[PDB]
Amino acid sequence: HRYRPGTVALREIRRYQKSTELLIRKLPFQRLVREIAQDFKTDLRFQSSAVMALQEASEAYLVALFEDTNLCAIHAKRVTIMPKDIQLARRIRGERA
Amino acid sequence: QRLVREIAQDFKTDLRFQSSAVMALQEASEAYLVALFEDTNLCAIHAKRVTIMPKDIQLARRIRGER
Amino acid sequence: KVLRDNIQGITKPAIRRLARRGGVKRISGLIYEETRGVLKVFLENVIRDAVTYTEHAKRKTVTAMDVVYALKRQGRTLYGFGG
Amino acid sequence: NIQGITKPAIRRLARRGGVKRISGLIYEETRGVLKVFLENVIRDAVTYTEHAKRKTVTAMDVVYALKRQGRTLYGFGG
Amino acid sequence: LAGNAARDNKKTRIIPRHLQLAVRNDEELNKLLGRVTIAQGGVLPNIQSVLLPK
DNA sequence: CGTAAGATCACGCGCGATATCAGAATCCCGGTGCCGAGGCCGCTCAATTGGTCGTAGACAGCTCTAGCACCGCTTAAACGCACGTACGCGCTGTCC
DNA sequence: GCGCGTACGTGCGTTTAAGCGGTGCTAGAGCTGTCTACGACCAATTGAGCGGCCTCGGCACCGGGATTCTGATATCGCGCGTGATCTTACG
Numbered sequence: 412h413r414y415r416p417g418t419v420a421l422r423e424i425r426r427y428q429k430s431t432e433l434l435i436r437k438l439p440f441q442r443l444v445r446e447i448a449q450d451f452k453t454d455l456r457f458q459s460s461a462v463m464a465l466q467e468a469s470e471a472y473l474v475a476l477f478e479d480t481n482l483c484a485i486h487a488k489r490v491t492i493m494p495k496d497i498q499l500a501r502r503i504r505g506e507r508a
Numbered sequence: 509q510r511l512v513r514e515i516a517q518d519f520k521t522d523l524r525f526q527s528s529a530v531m532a533l534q535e536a537s538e539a540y541l542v543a544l545f546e547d548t549n550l551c552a553i554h555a556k557r558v559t560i561m562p563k564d565i566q567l568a569r570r571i572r573g574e575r
Numbered sequence: 576k577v578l579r580d581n582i583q584g585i586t587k588p589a590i591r592r593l594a595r596r597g598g599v600k601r602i603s604g605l606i607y608e609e610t611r612g613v614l615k616v617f618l619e620n621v622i623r624d625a626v627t628y629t630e631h632a633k634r635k636t637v638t639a640m641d642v643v644y645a646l647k648r649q650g651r652t653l654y655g656f657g658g
Numbered sequence: 659n660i661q662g663i664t665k666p667a668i669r670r671l672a673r674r675g676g677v678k679r680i681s682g683l684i685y686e687e688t689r690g691v692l693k694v695f696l697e698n699v700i701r702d703a704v705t706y707t708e709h710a711k712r713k714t715v716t717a718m719d720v721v722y723a724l725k726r727q728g729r730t731l732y733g734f735g736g
Numbered sequence: 737l738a739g740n741a742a743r744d745n746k747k748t749r750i751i752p753r754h755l756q757l758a759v760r761n762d763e764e765l766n767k768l769l770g771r772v773t774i775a776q777g778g779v780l781p782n783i784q785s786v787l788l789p790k
Numbered sequence: 791c792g793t794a795a796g797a798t799c800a801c802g803c804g805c806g807a808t809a810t811c812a813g814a815a816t817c818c819c820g821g822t823g824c825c826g827a828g829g830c831c832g833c834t835c836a837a838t839t840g841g842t843c844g845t846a847g848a849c850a851g852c853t854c855t856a857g858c859a860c861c862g863c864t865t866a867a868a869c870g871c872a873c874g875t876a877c878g879c880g881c882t883g884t885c886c
Numbered sequence: 887g888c889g890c891g892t893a894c895g896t897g898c899g900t901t902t903a904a905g906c907g908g909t910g911c912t913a914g915a916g917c918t919g920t921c922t923a924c925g926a927c928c929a930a931t932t933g934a935g936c937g938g939c940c941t942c943g944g945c946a947c948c949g950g951g952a953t954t955c956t957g958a959t960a961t962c963g964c965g966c967g968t969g970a971t972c973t974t975a976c977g
Contacts, residue, residue: 412812412813412814412956412957412958413957414814414956414957415956415957417678417679417789418789418956420673420678420679421678421783421787421788421789422815423670423673424673424674424676424677424678424783425781425783426673427670427673427674428673428674428676428778428779428780428781428782429778429781430778431752431753431756431776431777431778434667434670434671434674435663435667435671436664436667439662439663439664440662440663442659442662443659443660443662443663443696444696444700446659446660447693447696447697447700448700448704448715451700451701451704452704452708454713455704455707455713455714455715456713456714456715457714457715458714458715458716458717460717460734461703461715461716461717461719461720461734463717463734463775464717464720464721464724464731464733464734464775465696465699465700465720467731467733467773467775467776468699468720468724468729468731468773469692469695469696469699470671471773471777472695472729472773473671473675473688473691473692474671474674474675474779475675476675476691477671477672477675477676477677478675478676478779479570479571480675480677481675481676481677481678481784482567482570482571482784483551483554483567483571485784485786485787486551486554486555486563486564486567487554487555487556488555490678490679490786490787491678491679491680491681492672492677492679492680492681492684493681493683493684494681494683494684494687495554496554497684497687497688497691498687499550499551499554500571501691502550503547503550503551503568503571503572504571504572504573510578510581510584511581511582511584511585511618512618512622513578513581514578514579514581515615515618515619515622516622516626516637517578519619519622519623519626520626520630522635523626523629523635523636523637524635524636524637524857524858524913524914525636525637525857526636526637526638526639526856526857527856527857528639528656529625529637529638529639529641529642531639531656532639532642532643532646532653532655532656533618533621533622533625533642535653535655536621536642536646536651536653537614537617537618537621538593539653540617540651541593541597541610541613541614542593542596542597543597544597544613545593545594545596545597545598545599546597546598548597548599549597549598549599549600552599557877557878558600558601558876558877558878559601559602559603559877559878559893560594560599560601560602560603560606561603561605561606562603562605562606562609565606565609565610565613566609569613573770575767586867586868586869587868587869588867588868588869601876601877601893601894601895602894603893604893604894634914634915635913635914635915636857636913636914636915674778674779675779676782676783676784676787678787728771729771729773730771730772730773731772731773731775732772732773732774732775733752733774733775733776734775747944747945748943748944748945749826749827749944749945789956
């Protein structure tokens with residue numbers, strides 16, 4: 412049949428919140444990191460452990476940011492996070508100007 | 509000053525204060541509160557409202573990482 | 576002499592004035608007590624830290640430097656009173 | 659390159675964050691925030707590496723970079 | 737607390753997830769580790785009400 | 791006697807909760823492999839002790855200065871009420 | 887977008903404790919002189935943690951079976967609407 416819109420999302424929330432495995436596949440993330448790093452210095456090497464630490468920190472930060480964003484969107488009587496929500500969150504945090 | 513004295517009293521009795529210390533405390537308090545109100549107003553605006561309301565303060569303090 | 580209910584010394588007009596300096600235009604009635612609570616929390620934390628420093632110092636009087644140290648501890652550094 | 663952070667991956671992250679409904683422009687905004695965050699952290703990490711006179715960025719350098727930013731990380735020899 | 741959690745999850749060796757659970761679930765430890773992200777830690781299960789089905 | 795209005799029963803239709811199927815979710819359990827965990831043995835390398843020196847710190851005493859307290863005085867600030875008007879809340883249509 | 891209820895602003899009136907000044911008392915803060923306890927260090931000693939190398943198993947995996955959960959549907963129930971029968975009133 413069909414699941415009503417908005418149900419499979421709840422299942423996935425239960426699913427992902429119970430595990431801890433990283434959610435971004437490694438290789439694209441690593442290539443992004445190397446691209447970004449290149450702009451500060453040429454011919455640079457990275458310990459895989461360093462890349463893993465970068466990914467850990469980045470994903471944890473993103474999850475926290477989304478938590479705050481969902482909180483904002485709920486406050487705005489909404490259920491769909493929208494860019495303005497992230498902007499408000501970061502602004503209050505003090506990260507964005 | 510009276511409020512500060514009371515609060516300190518409950519943390520420890522028989523304390524005296526340099527006036528300058530009280531003034532610094534008041535400055536930091538007013539600055540903190542003004543920033544808090546700024547963030548509250550931001551939240552109020554995001555909620556398509558114009559009157560700041562308590563829940564706005566709680567949201568601001570949550571996002572700030574205050575408890 | 577005992578001190579009591581000094582939190583209400585933070586009168587409504589004063590909170591309104593602050594909210595004005597914060598850019599607020601229209602103030603809901605319940606905002607005042609919530610603001611009182613927030614101020615009480617913040618003051619409790621700062622005064623706990625400052626009193627701690629004073630205790631270590633073995634002084635019966637709180638010095639501005641104690642306040643400045645406490646504030647810097649809270650990631651809320653203050654200029655204008657030394658340090 | 660940056661786009662390699664696939665939209666569904668962003669969805670997965672948000673789900674772990676507790677989000678139920680996601681907008682289109684979100685994905686790109688999240689990409690931007692991630693790019694900035696990485697930029698700051700990697701900048702600091704390189705700086706640390708350079709002062710060490712090493713061509714290989716170490717985990718420890720990442721750790722100090724995160725600690726500077728008030729985003730302390732555990733599990734990599736803190 | 738981490739061992740407690742691991743027992744609840746019916747495991748014999750403590751893994752990071754257990755540490756994260758013990759830390760975040762406890763109030764005082766969570767406050768202490770206020771600015772710390774634990775590798776392989778995840779988040780505490782939590783769904784906002786309005787998101788729940790009616 | 792004959793027609794018109796009102797009450798009550800019978801019958802029909804509409805909205806809500808709750809018995810049923812059914813595909814997807816989730817859990818449990820038999821049997822196997824493994825890489826990590828754990829213990830033992832060597833070996834460096836670290837922790838401890840006899841004993842010395844200046845050094846920091848403690849203590850005691852002399853000086854006194856801002857801290858505190860109270861009184862009178864002055865007045866800007868704080869609190870109560872009429873009202874009406876912008877603001878908040880709730881229902882509804884649309885289509886993104 | 888529309889409509890309705892109302893929280894609270896300005897303004898007035900009244901009331902009060904917030905600031906200045908004026909005096910008076912004094913607590914502990916601050917700065918000299920005494921006196922003493924202790925931590926770095928060298929020799930020399932001794933022994934513990936780290937790593938290498940063995941060993942063994944808690945748990946992932948597979949596969950299968952058994953137990954639960956939304957989505958759809960239909961019945962019971964309740965409430966609303968209409969026609970038949972009994973009642974009352976008027977003609």
